[PDB]
Amino acid sequence: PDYCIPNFSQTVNERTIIDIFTICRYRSPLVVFCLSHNELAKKYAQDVSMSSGTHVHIIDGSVEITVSLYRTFRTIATQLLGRMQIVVFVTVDKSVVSTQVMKSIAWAFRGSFVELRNQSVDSSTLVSKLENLVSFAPLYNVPKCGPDYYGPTVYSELLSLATNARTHWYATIDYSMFTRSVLTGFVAKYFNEEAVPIDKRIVSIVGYNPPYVWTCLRHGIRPTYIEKSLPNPGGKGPFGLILPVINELVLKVKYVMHNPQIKLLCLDTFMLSTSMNILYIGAYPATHLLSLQLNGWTILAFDPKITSDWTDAMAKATGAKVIGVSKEFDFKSFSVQANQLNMFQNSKLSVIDDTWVETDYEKFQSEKQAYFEWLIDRTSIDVRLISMKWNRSKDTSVSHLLALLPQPYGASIREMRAFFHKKGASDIKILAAETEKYMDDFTAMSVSDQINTQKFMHCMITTVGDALKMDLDGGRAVIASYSLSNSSNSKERVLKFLSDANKAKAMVVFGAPNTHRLAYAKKVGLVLDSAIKMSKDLITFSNPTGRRWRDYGYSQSELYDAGYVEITIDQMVAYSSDVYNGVGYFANSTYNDLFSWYIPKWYVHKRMLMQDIRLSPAALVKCFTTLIRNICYVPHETYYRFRGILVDKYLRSKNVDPSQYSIVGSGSKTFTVLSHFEVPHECGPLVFEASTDVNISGHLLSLAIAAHFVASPMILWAEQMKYMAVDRMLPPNLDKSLFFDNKVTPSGALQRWHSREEVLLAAEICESYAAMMLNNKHSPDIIGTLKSAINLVFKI
Amino acid sequence: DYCIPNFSQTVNERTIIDIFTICRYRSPLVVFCLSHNELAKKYAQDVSMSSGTHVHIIDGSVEITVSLYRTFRTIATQLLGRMQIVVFVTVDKSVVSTQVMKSIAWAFRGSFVELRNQSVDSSTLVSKLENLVSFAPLYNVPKCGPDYYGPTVYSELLSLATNARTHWYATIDYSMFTRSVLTGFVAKYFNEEAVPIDKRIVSIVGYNPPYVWTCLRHGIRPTYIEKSLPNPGGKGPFGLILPVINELVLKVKYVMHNPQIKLLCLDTFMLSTSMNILYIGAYPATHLLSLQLNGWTILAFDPKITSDWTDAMAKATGAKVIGVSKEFDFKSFSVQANQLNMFQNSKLSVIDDTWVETDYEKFQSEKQAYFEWLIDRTSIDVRLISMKWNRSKDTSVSHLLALLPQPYGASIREMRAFFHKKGASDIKILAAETEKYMDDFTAMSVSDQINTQKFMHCMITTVGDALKMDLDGGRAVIASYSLSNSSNSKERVLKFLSDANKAKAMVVFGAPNTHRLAYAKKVGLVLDSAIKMSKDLITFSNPTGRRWRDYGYSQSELYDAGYVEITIDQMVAYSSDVYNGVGYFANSTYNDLFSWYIPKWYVHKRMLMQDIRLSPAALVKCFTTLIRNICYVPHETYYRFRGILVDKYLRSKNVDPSQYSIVGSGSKTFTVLSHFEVPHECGPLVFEASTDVNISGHLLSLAIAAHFVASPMILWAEQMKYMAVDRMLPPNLDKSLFFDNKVTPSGALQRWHSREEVLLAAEICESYAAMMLNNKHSPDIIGTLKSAINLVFKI
Ligand SMILES: Nc1nc2c(ncn2[C@@H]2O[C@H](COP(=O)(O)O)[C@@H](O)[C@H]2O)c(=O)[nH]1
Numbered sequence A: 001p002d003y004c005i006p007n008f009s010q011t012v013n014e015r016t017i018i019d020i021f022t023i024c025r026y027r028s029p030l031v032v033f034c035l036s037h038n039e040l041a042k043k044y045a046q047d048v049s050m051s052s053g054t055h056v057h058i059i060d061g062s063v064e065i066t067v068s069l070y071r072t073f074r075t076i077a078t079q080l081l082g083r084m085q086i087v088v089f090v091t092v093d094k095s096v097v098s099t100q101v102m103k104s105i106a107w108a109f110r111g112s113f114v115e116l117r118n119q120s121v122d123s124s125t126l127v128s129k130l131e132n133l134v135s136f137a138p139l140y141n142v143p144k145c146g147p148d149y150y151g152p153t154v155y156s157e158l159l160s161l162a163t164n165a166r167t168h169w170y171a172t173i174d175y176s177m178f179t180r181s182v183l184t185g186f187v188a189k190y191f192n193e194e195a196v197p198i199d200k201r202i203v204s205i206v207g208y209n210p211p212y213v214w215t216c217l218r219h220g221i222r223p224t225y226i227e228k229s230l231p232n233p234g235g236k237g238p239f240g241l242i243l244p245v246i247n248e249l250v251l252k253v254k255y256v257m258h259n260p261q262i263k264l265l266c267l268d269t270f271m272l273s274t275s276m277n278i279l280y281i282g283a284y285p286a287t288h289l290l291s292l293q294l295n296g297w298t299i300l301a302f303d304p305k306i307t308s309d310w311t312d313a314m315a316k317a318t319g320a321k322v323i324g325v326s327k328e329f330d331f332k333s334f335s336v337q338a339n340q341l342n343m344f345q346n347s348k349l350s351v352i353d354d355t356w357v358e359t360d361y362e363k364f365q366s367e368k369q370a371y372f373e374w375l376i377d378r379t380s381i382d383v384r385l386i387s388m389k390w391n392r393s394k395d396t397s398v399s400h401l402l403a404l405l406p407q408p409y410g411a412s413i414r415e416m417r418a419f420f421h422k423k424g425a426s427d428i429k430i431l432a433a434e435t436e437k438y439m440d441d442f443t444a445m446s447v448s449d450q451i452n453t454q455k456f457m458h459c460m461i462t463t464v465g466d467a468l469k470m471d472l473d474g475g476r477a478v479i480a481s482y483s484l485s486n487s488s489n490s491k492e493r494v495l496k497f498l499s500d501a502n503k504a505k506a507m508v509v510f511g512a513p514n515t516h517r518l519a520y521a522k523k524v525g526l527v528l529d530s531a532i533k534m535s536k537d538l539i540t541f542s543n544p545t546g547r548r549w550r551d552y553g554y555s556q557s558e559l560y561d562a563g564y565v566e567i568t569i570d571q572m573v574a575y576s577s578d579v580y581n582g583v584g585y586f587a588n589s590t591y592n593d594l595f596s597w598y599i600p601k602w603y604v605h606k607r608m609l610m611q612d613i614r615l616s617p618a619a620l621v622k623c624f625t626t627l628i629r630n631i632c633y634v635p636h637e638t639y640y641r642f643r644g645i646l647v648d649k650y651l652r653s654k655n656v657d658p659s660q661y662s663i664v665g666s667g668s669k670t671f672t673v674l675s676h677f678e679v680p681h682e683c684g685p686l687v688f689e690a691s692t693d694v695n696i697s698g699h700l701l702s703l704a705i706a707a708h709f710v711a712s713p714m715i716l717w718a719e720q721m722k723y724m725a726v727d728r729m730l731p732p733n734l735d736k737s738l739f740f741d742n743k744v745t746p747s748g749a750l751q752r753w754h755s756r757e758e759v760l761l762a763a764e765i766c767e768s769y770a771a772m773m774l775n776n777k778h779s780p781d782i783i784g785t786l787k788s789a790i791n792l793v794f795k796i
Numbered sequence B: 001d002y003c004i005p006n007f008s009q010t011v012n013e014r015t016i017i018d019i020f021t022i023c024r025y026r027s028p029l030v031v032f033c034l035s036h037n038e039l040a041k042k043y044a045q046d047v048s049m050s051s052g053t054h055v056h057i058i059d060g061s062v063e064i065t066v067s068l069y070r071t072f073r074t075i076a077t078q079l080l081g082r083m084q085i086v087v088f089v090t091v092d093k094s095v096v097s098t099q100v101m102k103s104i105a106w107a108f109r110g111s112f113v114e115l116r117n118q119s120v121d122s123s124t125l126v127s128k129l130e131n132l133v134s135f136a137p138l139y140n141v142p143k144c145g146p147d148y149y150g151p152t153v154y155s156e157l158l159s160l161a162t163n164a165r166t167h168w169y170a171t172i173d174y175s176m177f178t179r180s181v182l183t184g185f186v187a188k189y190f191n192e193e194a195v196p197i198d199k200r201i202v203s204i205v206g207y208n209p210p211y212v213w214t215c216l217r218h219g220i221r222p223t224y225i226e227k228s229l230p231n232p233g234g235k236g237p238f239g240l241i242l243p244v245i246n247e248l249v250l251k252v253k254y255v256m257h258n259p260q261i262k263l264l265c266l267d268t269f270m271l272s273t274s275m276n277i278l279y280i281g282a283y284p285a286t287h288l289l290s291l292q293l294n295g296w297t298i299l300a301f302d303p304k305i306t307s308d309w310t311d312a313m314a315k316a317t318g319a320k321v322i323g324v325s326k327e328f329d330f331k332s333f334s335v336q337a338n339q340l341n342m343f344q345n346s347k348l349s350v351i352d353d354t355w356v357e358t359d360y361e362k363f364q365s366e367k368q369a370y371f372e373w374l375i376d377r378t379s380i381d382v383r384l385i386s387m388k389w390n391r392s393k394d395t396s397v398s399h400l401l402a403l404l405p406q407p408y409g410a411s412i413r414e415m416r417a418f419f420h421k422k423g424a425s426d427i428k429i430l431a432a433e434t435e436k437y438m439d440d441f442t443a444m445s446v447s448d449q450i451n452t453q454k455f456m457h458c459m460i461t462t463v464g465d466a467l468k469m470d471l472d473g474g475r476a477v478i479a480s481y482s483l484s485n486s487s488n489s490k491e492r493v494l495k496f497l498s499d500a501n502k503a504k505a506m507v508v509f510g511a512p513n514t515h516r517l518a519y520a521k522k523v524g525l526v527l528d529s530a531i532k533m534s535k536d537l538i539t540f541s542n543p544t545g546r547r548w549r550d551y552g553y554s555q556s557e558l559y560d561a562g563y564v565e566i567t568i569d570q571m572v573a574y575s576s577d578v579y580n581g582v583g584y585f586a587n588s589t590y591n592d593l594f595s596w597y598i599p600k601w602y603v604h605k606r607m608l609m610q611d612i613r614l615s616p617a618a619l620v621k622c623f624t625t626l627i628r629n630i631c632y633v634p635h636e637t638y639y640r641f642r643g644i645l646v647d648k649y650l651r652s653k654n655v656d657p658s659q660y661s662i663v664g665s666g667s668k669t670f671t672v673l674s675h676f677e678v679p680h681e682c683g684p685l686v687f688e689a690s691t692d693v694n695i696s697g698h699l700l701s702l703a704i705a706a707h708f709v710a711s712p713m714i715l716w717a718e719q720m721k722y723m724a725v726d727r728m729l730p731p732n733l734d735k736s737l738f739f740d741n742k743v744t745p746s747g748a749l750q751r752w753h754s755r756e757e758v759l760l761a762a763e764i765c766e767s768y769a770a771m772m773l774n775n776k777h778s779p780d781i782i783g784t785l786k787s788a789i790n791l792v793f794k795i
């Protein structure tokens, strides 16, 4: 035993399990770089491999593209835990493989994607981004699974002596930002695929979570928050939002956001959430809007600096109906028919006012105030909210004033924002002495304390109510995790709520800590009791800052019995690749991997049974097995011999007579049947006809290992495996290259994968397979919940 | 911290443990030579798609020098990635020879396959190509050697009858590889020094059985030296007639798989006693084909000997063989008969392997009379005669030195009688006592039987203290535990080694490395229940339960005595063209605790010019890359970190920061603005203004590698000092061997670093190791290397 190979007894201990968890933080080493100049590709490929050992591939066109993709990415799928950079240069034209297809492939393998096939050989962009490969390897400054990034990691700082060649790195926070972004993008993809009308692209966020305002507007979605109780902001007015009171954050380390013109994005993404029609006064330039998707929005912009080119550019970039007007806004006409407001009749309207003067400012504002006080009251228009900049040294009385707030990304600015609303205060006297004293307290707070005051404006798009009783009709979109997962929320009452949402054809995306993965991480000693405790399903969390909170853990089998399928964040962004406008990430996160995300069973069966590369588990089914085989001296053919030996032991334990089968143990045949026999199973008996070949599913086995360390696509894969029990046709509306990893019959159809017996047999040896691979340091709980979920998928 | 690069949260003691573990996998390379490029491309695809093996093809579309340079710079960074690497060479033998590609492969600890003149459908070619896909990430060709004869049988990995398992004794197998490589290095020395064949002898200090086989695989004859010999307890003068036994420890069943091991065990011993052999009954003796016996003469008697057999035996072994197709005449009794005239006034030994089914015990008596006669010649110096012994009745025997059992004979009841002149004059061997002696022998385990070869090998063993031996003539000696153990003090050992380097002898010395062993204990890899240490006094223990004392040595102590550390990897690659030993499959933590050393005089004579066989290329980058990946160190950031360390050091020595501008790139560490000096043990380091300084990166990387495995640092330092100026390429050697060195326009090898750029790197070396290993480095290891480099750059 100790002196034999393959060897699991000396090589796989609790320490090796720890190291595998650690290696999982590095499971995204891929960069996909598209350019149109092959000699330039060969030069930097050799440069980055000679200097840092980056594995490089070039898809040059000397081989057909489908074959080129299949060979390259079947190789790469096994190296993803090798802790070394991988770079695929793509030099074929866009007519051979399109930008959107290559982006789907790259993101399905957790890679960064760079598209530069239109640039000539000596572009500044092209040479610079190619030289970055050599400078940064094994790192790269293009995010994985997303073109954009705005966190504190600044890659140029790694090359500067002034910074000591260092930069910030908040893997957990950044991956949490990437997750909120992807969940939003998946809802965006769901809205397009279900042809949901534009003015109904609304998503309910259960529990307040500020970044969803920006992510939703980046995708043309309006967010609504749902909260159990209403925290009294402590200010004046009917909702307490006139000079609200503050309570401070805890000592930490600071996470800084580097969005350009962040102060304008914060107010404008919020206002755009309130109405599909916007009156924007002072809009020039509004370059910050160019990065949003505003399909269905109508913006009536007023600024003397508006040109005809500005209106055309803004509409082209955002997709919104923009109507630029190069006149100063006339605040002293009190008519609807003036200022072109006629278009907004019998519809809702919100107003954003960014106008300011250097002459007669303080009474210029009361002209605007008197006009906005008049404007909020029309019955031919449903004016929802008016944003105005406020700075007064003289006391004023204001009507319909709902809120008077500081600016979260305002720093030392003495300027405030006033919000007008129908349900606001009938009258209130704003004494300029207390706003000055208020702005002195605000400007003396830490930037972190200032940014958290955005909860005051965001509560103007918040609803009070129990999320477990909301209306689910209309395919309503809901994203829900902590605030739903546990507020002492009964696990029964949550599971029933999710069960009803699936039956109502609703889109409630749900996330929760994975009970059995967390347990396994604690047992092997990766997560310590001082950081995370657990008693059955109840979890007590803590982050390194000192905050603690309770949460309920769920498992894949509990949610499948409630009509919910686990899908990974990787699969979600790849599936949504042609709609995603979010951020990417640079590092994976152990803490984020403890959580699993789920989607309703009805939407899986409707849209997801035909697995192309976007929903492939290829980035998980090969790299864990390959890593273990390298540590444990498991030759390639020896691995397949082991699968036969485990089948032989299993069949003997079910009192099958060995004379009825012949163990082969190959890559194509597990065993041959001699006499017909049957094996008891909960999904009905497994029937093996005599003189047949049986080849059990390796995807199931290797995903069982993978489910110990990261979120598993096991249940989504199982549903696609059942679908692929017979030959299928390739969908005609999808690009053929998305199927390079789907094997094809001689007639050009999609070949069947496995029979039902071949799948469920793998489920039965699955426990002993993990016990073998992990030296009995596996988790029977994780195997059992998966096993129990495979059985429900194949239920008879 | 919340910053990258990050060493504080990524490198703790557990991370150090893993690096030590990963070192067991530091030989993932296979170099496969074949002439068919589309076949290489087909299997390069099959092995990478199925197992993730990284594949390279040297296909001749690019000039060979830069193809090697590009491919092996890439590979050198990946040797610790725990993934197999395969390089296919499809260019012709005239573009890069077999012996040059073998040196390259072994210099990178790879296995080597040469099949370049085989058809695209050759049985062996397609078989060994399919073995790549079937065995990956393993391969069945040994690393750093063509042959393997241990218990690991790769075919069992594919057999369901075996449960797809096989034996795996990494520590013993690597110790066998080490013995073999040391022997080969002594053989390469014998070639370079033009040592006459009849004087190719090596003295193994301390009895060490496998050296008999490794020496005869290289045309060398072994001699053991023991301080004292326990008398075997038997009869005759030297007590070798039926010696008594004391048996071994319960445990590991390591069974060597040599074909006809019974004959190799005797024949390699008999071949150690004389260059001229009389082989009676020599057919077929296929076991001899594996040996290198150039300078031997074998006269072989067997009625089945053909002239083809005499040809294939001489072509394989290189020996001069006379093939007599006739029965030996044991009654002739003449020095001028049986063609024996050719041995007059020569040394001779006799291997007798004859038998008969009828007339046997009479046939033995006829043989015995001829041998008792033949041992007494004055015309020829008959040194030893071995005969099959199986007698049913008492006999008187003359000149009988030994009557031994067959160590690999298992249950066979026949024995071996050895005739020598210094043997018993008359002695009666009662057949009733041998019968019961063979009763006890055949009842022992196979390991107890095999160990009786000590009785044979004490006939090529001298008694005496090894520190008093004569070192004249460039004598070759292999010495390890039986020198460095606590019965002799270090001072008396170091003086012996110092007097041997002064005397221009080739004493190859090995010892455990004090600081590497202490570092493996401090971080928690080696526990006190296995190895304990009191300063430099080490108490070992292996899983069988045996315990022993030994003394640790350091690189500085031995450079003080005129000895240079050289790794096993460098020895086998330096000796590649003569090497005929075994390879290995896995590296061993236990063996990595040891260091081997050669005399400084020979380093200076033959090893200052660094071609790929002597380079540290397979160690100067794989640790740095592994750490850069763990700790998020970008490529250019790694070079700015280097300049920042020089900044912190120069300011610590009260250099004014205005005198230099830190650049921190791969080409320039910093630029000098004003002339300044920094004090140093070897004389001040002089930096003049308007100069670019680029310190030695290899020294920094090697200091890291010296924490985990043996270091070529001191050999590298001697080659570095020799490279302060340009040096002319040797016109002897193939120029592909220098693919990794920069060659000047003129055709000579370009200077590497000035004296200032080396010693500056050695001074920031401690802080570099503190940075890379999160202050969990070994100051002892840094200091012993720093003091050895200082001694190398002495003025
Ligand atoms: N594209 C794709 N093919 C699969 C998947 N699962 C199985 N297959 C196909 O079915 C074959 C047999 O499945 P396996 O034995 O690997 O579970 C695979 O080699 C592959 O061709 C999958 O999840 N995605």
Ligand SMILES: Nc1nc2c(ncn2[C@@H]2O[C@H](COP(=O)(O)O)[C@@H](O)[C@H]2O)c(=O)[nH]1
Binding pocket: B610, B615, B616, B695, B696, B697, B698, B699, B716, B740, B741, B742, B751, B752, B753
């Ligand atoms: N071939 C070879 N070149 C070396 C070695 N050490 C330094 N160099 C040369 O020295 C220069 C870089 O110095 P380093 O920073 O690598 O010590 C390069 O020109 C490199 O080729 C060595 O051990 N072998």
